[PDB]
Structure 1
């Protein structure tokens, strides 16, 4: 899963050539946080 910049739309394109977003001419992809259980210390 990779949310793109300048528009709210996930891509999930884990390919060796796909680097841009669908229906959007920009090529900046932010990795989306997956809801996993991590722990910290207070």
Structure 2
């Protein structure tokens, strides 16, 4: 699951050649943060 840039759409592309956002034209993707438990010491 990847998030595009100025356009809001989930890419979810894992192919090597798939770097361009679908239904878009920009090639900038941000990795989305999943629901994982992380422990921190205050």
> Which consecutive residues of structure 2, in runs of 5 or more, have no partner in the other structure?
none
- Bigger fraction of residues in strand: 2
Q: TM-score, structure 1 length as denominator?
A: 0.94
Match of 2:6, SS state, is coil
Q: TM-score, structure 2 length as denominator?
A: 0.94
Structural RMSD (CA)? 0.5
Equivalent-residue separation in structure 1 for 2:41 and 2:8 (angstroms): 33
> Which consecutive residues of structure 1, in runs of 5 or more, have no partner in the other structure?
none
